[PDB]
Amino acid sequence: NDEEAVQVKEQSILELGSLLAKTGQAAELGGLLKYVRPFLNSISKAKAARLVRSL
């Protein structure tokens, strides 16, 4: 379903974010949180806030 797509999208955000963390990116990783802003409105506030705090 769509929930699976959202899930793999989230783990894609974590994966790519980890890659940017390993490559030492600042503006990219810092702008990632701004880029995922509209994506956080498609799901619950709990997972969104958790993602924000994690990143």
From Swiss-Prot:
Processing after translation: Phosphorylated by AMPK.
Cellular compartments annotated: Nucleus; Cytoplasm, Cytosol
Top-rank taxon: Eukaryota
UniProt tissue specificity: Highly expressed in embryonic stem cells (ESCs). Expression decreases as ESCs differentiate.
Induction, per UniProt: By FOXO4; expression in embryonic stem cells (ESCs) is mediated by FOXO4.
Oligomeric and partner information: Component of the 19S proteasome regulatory particle complex. The 26S proteasome consists of a 20S core particle (CP) and two 19S regulatory subunits (RP). The regulatory particle is made of a lid composed of 9 subunits including PSMD11, a base containing 6 ATPases and few additional components.
Similarity comment: Belongs to the proteasome subunit S9 family.
Biological function: Component of the 26S proteasome, a multiprotein complex involved in the ATP-dependent degradation of ubiquitinated proteins. This complex plays a key role in the maintenance of protein homeostasis by removing misfolded or damaged proteins, which could impair cellular functions, and by removing proteins whose functions are no longer required. Therefore, the proteasome participates in numerous cellular processes, including cell cycle progression, apoptosis, or DNA damage repair. In the complex, PSMD11 is required for proteasome assembly.
Protein name (database record): 26S proteasome non-ATPase regulatory subunit 11
Species assigned in the record: Homo sapiens (Human)
